[PDB]
Structures are given as C-alpha cells and as structure tokens.
C-alpha cells in the first residue's frame, strides 16, 4: 500500500515508515482434550492378515499412549523471560485432583464447552479427535465376535486415518521434550483453530486480523503437556493474545558510517546500535532489537512484546536530529572500516570502504551506480542486485516510495585525534562527555608546562 | 518438592536453590542397522491396480535407498567444540573394509549382539526394522508367480506400515544434511531406546534417570549416517552419557541494578554478567551461561557440559558477599537505565527506572505491588502477572519457598564522578583497581598545581 521509507545521511540510517502492526501483549491458554480409550486386552488367538494389521495398529496406539504417559546489536540490554509460564500455570492448576472429572462432565454433551475451573480462570476446553467415541463400539465389539476376524478391509484404513493425528501428536511432542513451537496443523486443525480464535475473549478486529493471518498465530503459539491419565489426554495450546492493533511501527536499519580517510587503518567510525522495530503503543514505543523474533508477513508486523524494551516517544526525534537533547540516541564506536551493506525494506544501504568495488546492478541493464566511498543509499526502482566487494545481496522488490534526506555524515563533526573508539555501546551524550573530558585533559596537559 | 530461592538486593540477583541435576560428561555411540533388501528386477509386464500400487511403493523404496546411497552475557567467554566427534569417529572406524560383514555375521541370530570391532571399542549394534527378512519371501515370490498379480489387498498396506520407518528416515536425514537433532521416534522407537539404555554400560541410577526422563535423552542425542552399501544400511545414534547424579545446580538470574538518580540520563549502573546455571561436580562447579542449552524438565537440570566453564567453589561465596576477596565476581558496567524485568524460577525481579509504571497484578484481585525505583523482587505466592512499562511477563507458578535478604544496592557504594562505564565484561577487583587508579590520578592532578 504505502510502505514508504526515508534515508538519513547523518548516520546513514534507513527508516521504513508505515508498517501497521500487531503486538503480543498477552497469552491465552486453551485446553485441548483428546478423548482416549482404555483397552483391557486384545488377545486374538486366531490369526489372519487383516487382523494382524489391526493388531499392529492397536499395538502402535498402545505404545503411543505409553509414550504420552511418559510424556507428563542491542540484544544484551534487554529483558529475559520464560515464554511458557501461562501453560505451566494452567497445567499445575489442572494437576490437582477433581478437575479432570469436571472437564469430562462438562464436555459430555457440548463439543466446545467452557470450564470455569477451580482457580477462577476460564479456559476453553474442547475435543478435536473423539477417539473414545470411535473405539467405543466400532472396533472392540467387532474384534470379539467372529473369533478375532474383520469382515471388511476398509476399517483398518479408517483406523489409520483416525490414528494419524494421535501418532503425530506422539512424535511431535516426543521430539521437542514437552514444549514445542510452532504448533503443527495436526496438533490443531485449522478449522478448529479458526473456531477457537472466534470463540475466545478478544476484539472482533483482532478476530479479523487473526483469521486473515493464522500463519503467524500458528508460528507464535506454544503447546505444553497436561495430565494424561483417566483416558482424557489433554494439552494446553497457549495462543497469542494480540494487544494494540494497526499501529505505525517504523523499522530502523543502520550501517557502519566510518571516515573517508584511506591512510592505513586510522579510521573513526560510528555505527548506530539501534537496529530493529519501533512500534507505537500507549504513550510509549516498544523497541524490538531482535530482528529474528518479529515477523513481517504482508505489511503487518507481528512481534514479541516479551522480548522488547520500552522507550519514550522522543526516540522518534532521534530519527531527525542525532544531537537532539531530548532523547539520548545510542551509537557504537569502532575503528574497523570494512565494507558492509544492509538492504532495507525497499532499497539498500551500502558503505564501501578502503579499496572495494561495489555496484547496483539491474538484471536487464547492468551496473548503474558504482558507489564511491561513504554511506550511500540505492532505491528499489531501478535495481534488483547490490554487490559489495565480492558478496551479492538481493534487494527487496516491494513497491513503495523512497525519500533521500540529504546531509553530511557525523564523522566530519568529530575530531579524529581525540575521539574514543572502545565503546561497544554508548550514547551521543556519553561520547560527547568523554570528548569534553579528553579536551580538558589536553588543555590541562598544555597548561601544566 | 523443595525448590527454594533467595533474592539478594546487593546486586538484585535471584538464586534459585535446589535443582538436583544431571550433566552430560560423556557420549556413547550405538550402531542402528536397518536390514535392507536388494532387488534385481521388478518387471511386471502385466498390470493391475494393486500391482500398480505395489510397484509405486517399491519404486519409492528404491528411490529412498538411492537417496540414502547419495546420503553417505558470558557467551563469548566459553569453549567451542564440535558435538558429533564420537559419531564421526565410529563412522570412520566402520568405513574400513570388512567391518559391516562382521556386523552382519554377529547379528544373524541375536537381535542385540555386541561386536568388539577393530579399534577395541565396544559398540551396541542392533536391528530395528529387519526389512530384509520381510522382503525375503513375502513379496518377491508372490510378485513372480501369478503373472505379477497379488491375490490379497492388505499386503500393500502392511508394506506401507513397514516402509514408513525407512521413508521417514530418508526424509529426516535428507532435510538435516547428515546429522540431525533431536532423534525422532521413528528414527529410534522408544521401546528400543529404553531397552538400549538398559543395555549400555552406565550406572543403574542413571538407568532410572534416563528411563524416567527419555524426553531429554531423546532431545540431546545426535544421529549420523554410516555405510549404506551391502544391503546393511547403518547409522550411529550417539546418545548422551550422564555423569554426576542429583547434584545441586543453583540457578543465578541477574537484572540491571542501575542508580536511583533521575536527572537526564547520567546514571551509573551495574549488571552482574553471570546469569545461568551452576552445577556441582567433582571438587568444582560447572558454569552454564547458555540458558538455552540447559533443559529444566521437572526439577532436574540436564545440561550440555561441552558448553560450560569450570570454576572453584568460591564462586558460591560470590553469592553472599560481592566484595569477597576469595573469588572475583564478574560484573558489567553500563550507563543506560532502561526498565527491565527478568522472571526467576518462582518470583520476578523487576527494575523500574526513569519514569516507568510497573505493577505485579494477580488475575483475581488486580494490581498489588506498584514497584518504585530500584531493583525489587515479587514472590510467586500472591501474583501471576508482572507488567513493566508496556510489556507483560507471566511469572512461573511453580511452588516453593522464597527468601528476601535485606541490604543496600552496591551502586551507592561507588563514586558517580569517577566510575568507569565502558566495560562490557569486567570484575569487582578490576573495577575497583580502575577506581583506585583514577582516584590516584585525581589526587596527582590536584597536587600538580
């Protein structure tokens, strides 16, 4: 639609603007029950081929049941939290005696009933497989009437189709300990996930968003085990509970802005250590530094609120004036001057440094730009390949408008003979304070003689 | 059971105490063999529906066999090692000529026989699928008697059931190059894994531990390809070999203990860069900084000792006295003062900083705490939700006892105008040495005039 961007040459930072987002401000627990069956014995003294097939399938189902019984740069400056606390909470509140029979009694007639539970928390509890009502009288009475013989052959294939879900549950849970992400489609069928999304206490706008975009909801949930005994086998599929809706979440990319000097390796360098997402919520912004935890599906930006910092809104004025005395922008200091490129949402930021050959090549024309020294930006329209040194990046071909804010780099605002190049993480105010301290150092060393 | 915890307000660090653990001090290699079959030709000039089905299945099996033939903060300060050296070692010692013929000769009668091999290493080598004994005379004589026609119809479904294991082996290995993790259930059936754990040269206590907890053993092993030829397709599953048993592994969480000052962003702030697990083994402690590599299944702490450091026992006295001159505690220095919360095993550590509203809300009462400035701890009993700024963490609901020791933050023990805040990793002795050096500079610069 209107995914624009701006490129600021002050720090050679890209800001892609217009990315109406959806955070993950809450969790929501929902207790899937699979109605299991208990079999006393499957003796079958007689032997036929189809009876051998159904015996092997029942043995695999029993082994699955026994299995389930046995199955009971600004990244450091963040907040770490376990992401499965709600599911463990409802599992612990299930594990007390008496709640299982309440679940089974409340799910006898209705398919998608709601259980009040002992804790006062409402959990949606609903069967999805109902294997008990199948095994009840379809296979056990047949197995024990004609001296363990099946008249038809389609029954074992029907049992295969019904038992595939439970066997995949067994495999997917046993591979991933007890907590697995993402939730698979045989873990929760998509019609049932749509019905569960529609039936849980959320905004109708969030219903529209999370029914149009069930892929990210599926890719963001967490399914944890619960009680298995009393043939009730249950697991909690903790689902995301999205908070703010359609909020402009601008994305910030940065590339190393070094000096233009070529002599040896004596170069000063500011790299803005602030890359990631900035979503607007409440009176603040959520900052997501982990670009691997925020999904970019369509033009909506789903994210993980638990893996975010909070910042005041003045960080928006960080985008315009890097020396603005309202918010302290975070930059990092470095002396290495390697050529590096980061491809933004539409264009590409390049910094070709020392002696390297970079070009912006289009597959229908050839090289068109041939970047010189310094940070530079190449728009989406015109190019489809960016080569920096001997590495090739493909630039995103997503349509939109680009703006180029002209200016001079902040390298020219610093004095190289006194500039500090140790800080892995710092700020503009801290760097300027150290510059002032070292300038007073120079002046007091001058006046001491 | 008795998972206790302590909160130290000196560095606002949580230590959860009592986590009887299990390291991974060794590997153990085991040679799974799938008995393959060689088919000269499957011509079948006549055609039928079921014969077409069995022909497509045999073609899929042949393609799978051909593909198998073609298939032949303290994180930097660690020790990096390849995790699959034992499986590669036994694969290399198998690759020499004549070994797999010995495997077949020793595995003809017994289903779990042991071979001595040429290297002197004893490897448990055994069959799990025995497809050669099935294809021997169940399908090939039938295919070549009634002009390529099958009288029955369940034989192809039985062949599907038997070939599902080999086809899933092909898929799971071709997806993950040659080395996959975790080992899947169709890669090694759990009855076979329990019998293999029972038969391998380990403590009986460790047998009980890895039979009750086959989940994490399944989630820590590594399966590697081996020789494919001579219809004796083999692969080595390298199983963890747990060392110490039920040793206390106290967990250390830290949160940024920044200063209480509010003027601009001139804050002096200490973050203990020591988070992770602490197990006791031999006369030392093993330190796991990677909290993503240690599983916390039940109250047992399985870990990966290849990603651990060794420390003397005096690091335990790092917990009580941060200025103790027996072990040098590791701290990091920072000026940024964002609000951050980590959630310990039972409670939550919060630090609400600058102008940031945080609360500890219970779902049945509402907000109960409303943290002020400074580090603070909120127990499990009373809350189930911790909001810091605009982010919402769920706190673990695991039962246990909490202690809250009283004291003053160590930032108040430091001088604001002389503190060094550029150390990504440092120690108490190093920081105090730099403080002493800078104070000596201050006194010599005062005395120079």
């Amino acid at each position: 639609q209107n995914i624009t961007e701006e490129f600021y040459q002050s720090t050679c930072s890209a800001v892609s603007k217009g990315y109406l987002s959806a955070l993950r401000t809450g969790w929501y627990t929902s207790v899937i029950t699979i109605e299991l069956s208990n079999i006393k014995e499957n003796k079958c003294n007689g032997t036929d081929a189809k009876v051998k097939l159904i015996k092997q399938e029942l043995d695999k189902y029993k082994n699955a049941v026994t299995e389930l019984q046995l199955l009971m740069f600004l990244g450091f400056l963040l907040g770490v939290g376990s992401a499965i606390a709600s599911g463990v909470a409802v599992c612990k509140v299930l594990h007390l005696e008496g709640e299982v029979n309440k679940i089974k009694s409340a799910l006898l007639s209705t398919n998608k009933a709601v259980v009040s539970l002992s804790n006062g928390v409402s959990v949606l509890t609903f069967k999805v497989l109902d294997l008990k009502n199948y095994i009840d009288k379809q296979l056990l009475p047949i197995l024990n009437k004609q001296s363990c013989s099946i008249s038809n052959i389609e029954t074992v294939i029907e049992f295969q189709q019904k038992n595939n879900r439970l066997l995949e549950i067994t495999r997917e849970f046993s591979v991933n300990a007890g907590v697995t992400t993402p939730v698979s489609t045989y873990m929760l069928t998509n019609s049932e996930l749509l019905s569960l999304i529609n039936d849980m206490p959320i905004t109708n706008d969030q219903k529209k968003l999370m029914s149009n975009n069930v892929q990210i909801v599926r890719q963001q949930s967490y399914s944890i085990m619960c009680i298995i005994k009393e043939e009730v086998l249950a697991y909690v599929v903790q689902l995301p509970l999205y908070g703010v809706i359609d909020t402009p979440c601008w994305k910030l990319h940065t590339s190393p802005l070094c000096t233009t000097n070529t002599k040896e390796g004596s170069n000063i360098c500011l790299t803005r250590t602030d890359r990631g997402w900035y979503c607007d919520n409440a009176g603040s912004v959520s900052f997501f530094p982990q670009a691997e935890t925020c999904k970019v599906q369509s033009n909506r930006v789903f994210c993980d609120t638990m893996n975010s910092l909070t910042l005041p809104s003045e960080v928006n004025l960080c985008n315009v004036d890097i020396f603005n005395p309202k918010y302290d922008c975070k930059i990092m200091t470095s002396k290495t001057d390697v050529s590096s490129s980061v491809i933004t949402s539409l264009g590409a930021i390049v910094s070709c440094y020392g002696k390297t050959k970079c070009t912006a090549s289009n597959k229908n024309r050839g090289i068109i730009k041939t970047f010189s020294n310094g940070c530079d930006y190449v728009s989406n329209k015109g190019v489809d390949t960016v080569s920096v040194g001997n590495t090739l990046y493909y630039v995103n071909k997503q349509e939109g408008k680009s703006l180029y804010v002209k200016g001079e780099p902040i390298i020219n605002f610093y004095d190289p003979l006194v500039f500090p190049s140790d800080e892995f993480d710092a700020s503009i105010s801290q760097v300027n304070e150290k510059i002032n301290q070292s300038l007073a150092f120079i002046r007091k060393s001058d006046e001491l003689l | 059971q008795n998972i206790t915890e302590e909160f130290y307000q000196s560095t606002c660090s949580a230590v959860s105490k009592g986590y009887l653990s299990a390291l991974r001090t060794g590997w153990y290699t085991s040679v799974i063999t799938i008995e393959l079959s060689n088919i000269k030709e499957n011509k079948c000039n006549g055609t039928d529906a079921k014969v077409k089905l069995i022909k497509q299945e045999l073609d899929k099996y042949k393609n799978a066999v051909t593909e198998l033939q073609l298939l032949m903060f303290l994180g930097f300060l660690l020790g990096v090692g390849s995790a699959i050296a034992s499986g590669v070692a036994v694969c290399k010692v198998l690759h020499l000529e004549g070994e797999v013929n010995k495997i077949k000769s020793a595995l003809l009668s017994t289903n779990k026989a042991v071979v001595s091999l040429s290297n002197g290493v004893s490897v448990l080598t055994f069959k799990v699928l025995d497809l050669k004994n099935y294809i021997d005379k169940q399908l090939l004589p039938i295919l070549n008697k009634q002009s390529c026609s099958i009288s029955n119809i369940e034989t192809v479904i039985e062949f599907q059931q038997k070939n599902n294991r080999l086809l899933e082996i092909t898929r799971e290995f071709s997806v993950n190059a040659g080395v996959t993790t975790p080992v899947s259930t169709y890669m090694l059936t759990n009855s076979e894994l329990l019998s293999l754990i029972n038969d391998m040269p380990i403590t009986n206590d460790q047998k009980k531990l890895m039979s009750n907890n086959v989940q994490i053993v399944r989630q820590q092993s590594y399966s590697i390809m081996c020789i494919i030829k001579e219809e004796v397709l083999a692969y080595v599953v390298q199983l963890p070999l747990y060392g110490v048993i039920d040793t206390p592994c106290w967990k250390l969480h830290t949160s940024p203990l920044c200063t209480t000052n509010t003027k601009e962003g001139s804050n002096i702030c200490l973050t203990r860069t020591d988070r992770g697990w602490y197990c006791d083994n031999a006369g030392s402690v093993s330190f796991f900084p990677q909290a993503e590599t240690c599983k916390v299944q039940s109250n047992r702490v399985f870990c990966d000792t290849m990603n651990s450091l060794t420390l003397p026992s005096e690091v335990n006295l790092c917990n009580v006295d941060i200025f103790n001159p027996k072990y040098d505690c590791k701290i990091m220095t920072s000026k940024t003062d964002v609000s951050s919360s980590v959630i310990t095993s039972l409670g939550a550590i919060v630090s609400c900083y600058g102008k940031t509203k945080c609360t500890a809300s219970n779902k049945n009462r509402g907000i109960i705490k409303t943290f002020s400035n400074g580090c603070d701890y909120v127990s499990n009993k009373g809350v189930d939700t911790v909001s810091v700024g605009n982010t919402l963490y769920y706190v673990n609901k695991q039962e246990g006892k909490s202690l809250y020791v009283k004291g003053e933050p160590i930032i108040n023990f430091y001088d604001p105008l002389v503190f060094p805040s550029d150390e990504f990793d440092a120690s108490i002795s190093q920081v105090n040495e730099k403080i002493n050096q800078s104070l000596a500079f201050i006194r010599k610069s005062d005395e120079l005039l």
């Epitope: 109406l20 401000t25 809450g26 929501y28 709601v114 409402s122 039936d199 849980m200 206490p201 959320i202 905004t203 109708n204 706008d205 969030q206 529209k208 968003l209 509970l241 999205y242 908070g243 703010v244 809706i245 359609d246 909020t247 402009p248 607007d280 919520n281 409440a282 009176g283 809104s313 | 809300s361 009462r365 509402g366 907000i367 909001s387 919402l392």
Partner: antibody, heavy 121, light 110 residues
Framework: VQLVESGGGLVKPGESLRLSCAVS????????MHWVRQAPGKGLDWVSS????????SYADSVKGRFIISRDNGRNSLSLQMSSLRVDDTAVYYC???????????????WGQGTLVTVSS | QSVLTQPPSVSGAPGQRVTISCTGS?????????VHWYQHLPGKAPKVIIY???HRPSGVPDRFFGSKSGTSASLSISGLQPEDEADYYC??????????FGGGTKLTVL
C-alpha cells in the same frame, strides 16, 4: 488529552453531513478511537469504532454501512459521513479515545465535550 | 433493549454502602470478557471510575469498589457523599452489537 469536536446542529432527515473531531493529542497514532451517542430518555448506546491505521473498521448492529468513519492521522482529526438519517439518531455524540487492554479490549477513556445532533422535523 | 440489564431505580441516603448490580448474557461478560463502569454527572463529560473490574484511574477516591463474577458485575460505594448523584453505567463486549452499553442507573441521595 482533552478532546474537542464540533459540527452539531439541526439536520433534516435523509441527507448526509460530516461530523468532525479535532483531538489535540500528542500520540494520536496508536490509541483506539470510537464514537458513542446518547439520547434523552433511553440509555446511552454505541455508534462506531476505528483502530490506528484504519484497516479494521467496526460498526454497531443498530447502524451498519450507513455511517462512514474515517480519520486523518496527519491532521489529527476524526470524521463521520452521516449517510442516511432516521428519527432515532438525534443524540449527543461523544468522541472517545481509549487505550489497548491487557488482552485487547478498550475501556473508553477520556471523553470529548459532546455535540448535539437533532434530526426531528 | 440492550443486552445489559440493571434496575434503574436505585437510590440511598448519604452514609451507608450502596451496590449497583448489572448482569449480562452468556455471550457478553461471562465469556472471559471485562466490565467497566463510568459516571455521568450532568454537565461535564462522562469519565471511567473502574476498568478491568478492579483497577482505578489517577483521580478516583476509595469510595468506589468494583467486582465481577460469572455473568454479573457489581460496584459498591461506601459512605455516599452528596454530589455523587449521577448515572452509573456498565459496559461489556457482546460479540454481536460490539461495545454494548447498559441502561444506566440513576443514583441520587435522599
């Protein structure tokens, strides 16, 4: 944070008009906004909603499709196109700016002054 | 006409506790949803006294105490004071008519 709007008066039934809201907030980009109404006699009701960018329009069941809600993010304003009119729509209308919930729901925070729209005769 | 039902004939003298109670259907309130209460003195705009059934905004005294249970919400006022005569409300999030509003209770002193 106070909301001020204008556009009221007497309007004959049937014809359309525009009712504008001139919120002077500082972060009118994330807050979920609504319009509510109240008539003398019967209780207060709900009219319309809008969430952020403007891709999640939601309406009441009493009036659907007839009212058009839009907002100018750059100019910091709301607007309702009042297409078609019946007798029941004579009411005092309130802009209402509310924050996102701990789950997703809005509790209708600080309200506007309230503009009277009369449609009788 | 609204799905929210409360009797709009509740009044009491200043001094004692008066409880306003409003109940909803199964689709609203009891299906895991929330109930918020607003106040409507004539003149100035309505403002929220209580949201999420427990919390309070910045300027709200200790007179107001709200609660919800099942499909019924209540709001108790302890020790009435004379200028509290207004229209107290309940709101909910019925999945049909989205942000449904109660009929309102006219609370007056005697």
């Amino acid at each position: 944070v106070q909301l001020v709007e204008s556009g009221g008066g007497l309007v004959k039934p049937g014809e359309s008009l525009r009712l504008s809201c001139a919120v002077s907030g500082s972060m009118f980009s994330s807050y979920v906004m609504h319009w509510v109404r109240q008539a003398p006699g019967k209780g207060l009701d709900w009219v319309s909603s809008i969430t952020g960018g403007g891709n999640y329009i939601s309406y009441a069941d009493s009036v659907k499709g007839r009212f058009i809600i839009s907002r100018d993010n750059g100019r910091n304003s709301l607007s309702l196109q009042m297409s078609s009119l019946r007798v029941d729509d004579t009411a005092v209308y309130y802009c209402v700016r509310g924050l996102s919930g701990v789950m997703g729901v809005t509790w209708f925070d600080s309200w506007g002054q309230g503009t009277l729209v009369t449609v009788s005769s | 006409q609204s799905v929210l039902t409360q009797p709009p004939s509740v009044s009491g003298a200043p001094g004692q506790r008066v409880t306003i109670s409003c109940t909803g259907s199964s689709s609203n309130i009891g299906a895991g949803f929330d109930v918020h209460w607003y106040q409507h003195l004539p003149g100035k705009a309505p403002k929220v006294i209580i949201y999420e059934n427990s919390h309070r905004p910045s300027g709200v005294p200790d007179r107001f105490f709200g609660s919800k249970s099942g499909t019924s919400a209540s709001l108790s006022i302890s020790g009435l004071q004379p200028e509290d005569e207004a229209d107290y409300y309940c709101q909910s999030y019925d999945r049909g008519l989205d942000w449904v509003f109660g009929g309102g209770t006219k609370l007056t002193v005697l």
